[PDB]
Amino acid sequence: QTWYHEGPNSLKVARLWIANYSLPRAMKRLEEARLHKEIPETTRTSQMQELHKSLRSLNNFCSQIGDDRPISYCHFSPNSKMLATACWSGLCKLWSVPDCNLLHTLRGHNTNVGAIVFHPKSTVSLDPKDVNLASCAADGSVKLWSLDSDEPVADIEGHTVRVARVMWHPSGRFLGTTCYDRSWRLWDLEAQEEILHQEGHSMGVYDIAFHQDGSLAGTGGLDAFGRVWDLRTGRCIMFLEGHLKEIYGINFSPNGYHIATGSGDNTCKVWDLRQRRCVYTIPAHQNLVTGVKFEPIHGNFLLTGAYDNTAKIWTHPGWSPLKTLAGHEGKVMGLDISSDGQLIATCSYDRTFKLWMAE
């Protein structure tokens, strides 16, 4: 019963914009991968072994009290010099890396805050007093923030129930949102109005991820089923199943091959998009996996965190237990990897966030 519905033409022009922005990026990605994969074998083995040893040699520091209430999300700015943390209070904070010094606390949220995400060009090509950050709350509310205001700017009022996650499209022109209406919306920044209201999930949607080249969008809902929509034409192309409990995390890989999902059944599933088949199932943790994060541009390892008090780093491919990051006295509610890959951040229910680095 794939009952369609005609929407606005703004949606069509935005789809064409996405298509002609994404296609050349995809071709460049394939060309780069083909060029790289044809280098001598010993060099690749040695470099990967050195990377594995460095990952094994990871140490914790700057364990900072982020707030008086549990910390719900942590993100790294482009250039990996600021860390944006959300709290179960109405407060969001920005810290300098790696000294972890508070910069211009943000205010405006009244309920528990969910995810807070920097713009893809926040600290590289955007003036501070423009739109730089986006955040969502436990009640239906989404707010945009700048780096020199401490107060929000033009909000979004298209949601009436809890908003689970917010993500920036790699181009930066569009902002994704997942609501508890069993749907997810796409908000256009230049047009400044919602352009797509996708409903394909049985229950409320929780997590959203965007493909690097801006072609696909992965969505994980509370129904243990995930979708892979094509932003060019909608038309969900891959319905992936195999989890029995809710999916709380989803993340694409720098290469267009793999997707990773975490669910409440304590497992982390690695799917291959070029085979439309689940390729691996990692028994990661002894509790629900909150978030799974592929490594940045290189994409050579996987990072997971669960409601047990540890996170874990696994090889990719191979999915071997490279390292376990312990120390937290509470549940790990979120984690992130610096775009340079030399720093990891993990927030916790213990009101603290820790930074892991190679010694």
């Binding site: 794939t2 009952w3 519905h5 949606l11 069509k12 990692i282 028994p283 002894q286």
Partner: protein, 193 residues
Amino acid sequence: PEIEWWDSYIIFGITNLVEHPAQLNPPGVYLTKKEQKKLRRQTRREAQKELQEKVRLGLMPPPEPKVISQGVHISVYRVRNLSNPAKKFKIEANAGQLYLTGVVVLHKDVNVVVVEGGPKAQKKFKRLMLHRIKWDTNKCVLVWEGTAKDRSFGEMKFKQCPTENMAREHFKKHGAEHYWDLALSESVLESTD
């Protein structure tokens, strides 16, 4: 590869339509003492009245003077050595009695036990395996504990394998080689310290 199947598909099928595709569904009070008393009193009174009216209508003579579905919990342990016959019998008997499906695979220093069933049976078996059995360096640890959509073996069976590849392929036959991979890697890292 040169193009991914989605990119090949697009190059045009684009128009302002939003999809709603293929909906798929996922995979008492107590009584108080007063109420108790009231219920018993009313029942007995009704019985007495019905018996009296039965007597009044001649049906009886007057009395004479008295003179895993919807989800199966899985757990995975590993033991250093498990060649003792009595302990193997204990494990098998308890697993069968608690209706715990799974397998035991013995190996050099890595004897992996996979059990599957319900939560209460899983807790009972975990208590047995971690507290009741006295292993004494011969230690027992819990490798993993989670849930899956459906069972994956039939019943306990003490398979023997002296080659890691044999154990891995045996596990893969069912489709559960990730447990062996995790247990083996954890064993290597344990041995390297």
